[PDB]
């Protein structure tokens with residue numbers, strides 16, 4: 001027992017981190033097969049970021065201007081192209097450490113692990129979620145761009161995020177591995193409106209199921225509710241509306257614990273209306289929303 | 305910016321995880337050079353755990369009774385010995401993936417990463433701390449024994465923990481890599497008294513410095529205190545007493561922020577006396593004590 005904000009083992013992804021330098025800018029790159037993926041803002045200087053014309057800046061760059069270093073050895077760049085907000089640097093050597101992989105565009109509310117990197121070297125790994133407003137609350141300093149978000153299913157790594165930016169609000173924006181930003185963000189140093197950061201209701205309920213499984217049960221009450229009644233409370237508290245799809249995904253957790261999804265919704269409604277009253281659930285004094293129902297089953301069953 | 309409960313990249317340790325089976329029991333092993341380290345309770349059946357005589361059970365075991373599998377290949381066991389609560393299984397092949405490493409016995413209040421494993425396969429990685437009562441609040445299911453705790457300094461892995469047990473209280477006890485338990489725990493299925501779980505004061509102050517650095521400043525007040533006055537409050541709230549050694553370790557964080565250690569102590573005293581009043585610090589509604597002053601500097605500076 002015990003429940004932790006657990007990340008996927010990062011070994012498969014560490015073997016893909018490289019350093020990419022173009023001019024004076026250095027960021028991280030992702031080497032899979034003979035391609036190195038990195039944010040296109042690697043061609044920008046600090047001045048360019050205010051209003052960059054990426055296509056115009058790219059014309060001035062050739063293959064030899066992209067320095068790609070994997071550990072201490074230099075990779076030969078034989079081609080370059082810009083796909084949306086990422087650069088694909090074709091190299092002459094396939095990464096011998098390339099795991100089985102996929103590129104996936106995740107939905108808001110989905111979780112993933114981030115291997116924070118600087119100069120192509122890993123610093124740490126943590127679990128986070130794509131917020132409903134398409135930002136992530138990461139831990140990224142200057143030089144962390146190109147660090148990737150991923151999930152692992154047995155031996156296949158599903159890369160879902162590449163870090164590009166920090167908004168003036170301290171939150172992070174990035175792209176999928178095809179270079180399309182999550183949300184309305186652009187790779188420009190300009191005022192960018194992050195919308196309301198709502199709580200991921202289905203994840204909070206999944207975490208409440210994880211607490212029941214691990215022994216914390218004080219919040220269980222004698223009440224039930226309906227999806228429409230629950231959603232009136234959820235709206236008031238800036239929670240995402242719970243749908244029948246969410247109830248279905250919570251089916252296996254409802255089955256294991258013997259607590260109906262709507263009964264767990266009524267416990268959540270009471271927790272929203274009354275607060276925790278100085279108590280904790282799974283060592284937290286707030287309702288945690290960064291564990292999906294799949295994460296709870298995975299951690300509670302020990303999937304390797 | 306942004307502050308996360310970040311773990312060390314787990315790649316170096318994943319390359320050392322093996323599966324160890326003896327009779328009907330299977331747990332994890334740590335293969336470094338030609339030795340596989342694992343908990344000695346691998347020789348026990350569920351019945352043996354109530355009152356095991358390890359030396360007597362070990363006599364009945366020979367090298368061929370320890371099945372060691374690294375991925376899908378079998379390792380030949382050429383020797384075995386019991387050192388405290390761990391077994392050292394000498395194999396005929398040095399682990400080709402052995403990183404630079406050390407075995408260190410950590411102090412309470414020190415943090416480390418855990419690579420939770422089942423059947424020699426990694427499931428996840430999370431950061432945790434050795435509690436002052438010598439327990440860890442992990443996420444370990446049956447079969448996770450032998451999973452290791454470690455820290456990394458550039459390229460050297462310092463293994464500090466090997467998981468052995470879950471107390472009936474849901475907390476975890478284990479050993480250093482020499483097989484000596486942290487705390488008074490024994491590898492027996494018996495009632496084991498975990499003492500008071502105090503809060504690691506120096507880590508809470510380090511985390512308050514991390515919050516100031518990352519922009520959360522509401523808790524900063526107009527007050528100061530003395531070490532003796534602070535410690536009267538710390539005692540009342542089951543916090544570890546702060547010493548001049550702790551003040552010295554917080555020196556660099558005090559220097560960077562310009563907030564004297566005793567001034568931060570007075571902010572902490574007010575937070576203990578008045579609570580958070582429905583507010584958060586670094587996304588937490590409680591005072592976090594699992595970041596050492598070294599962790600805060602490392603994360604805030606991007607050490608790879």
Ligand SMILES: Cc1ccn2cnnc2c1NC(=O)[C@@H]1CCOc2ccc(Cl)cc21
Nearest residue numbers: 041049140141142164165166187188189305
């Ligand atoms: C300075 C800094 C600090 C922490 N970071 C955490 N993550 N990235 C940073 C960071 N750098 C940036 O976000 C740069 C600098 C200028 O603004 C933009 C605008 C757009 C894009 Cl794609 C990148 C950037």
Ligand SMILES: Cc1ccn2cnnc2c1NC(=O)[C@@H]1CCOc2ccc(Cl)cc21
Nearest residue numbers: 001345353444445446468469470491492493
């Ligand atoms: C059953 C279970 C569940 C979650 N775990 C998380 N970690 N280890 C477990 C676990 N198994 C045990 O703790 C065993 C089983 C009997 O009690 C003892 C006593 C002493 C030792 Cl060294 C091991 C064990």
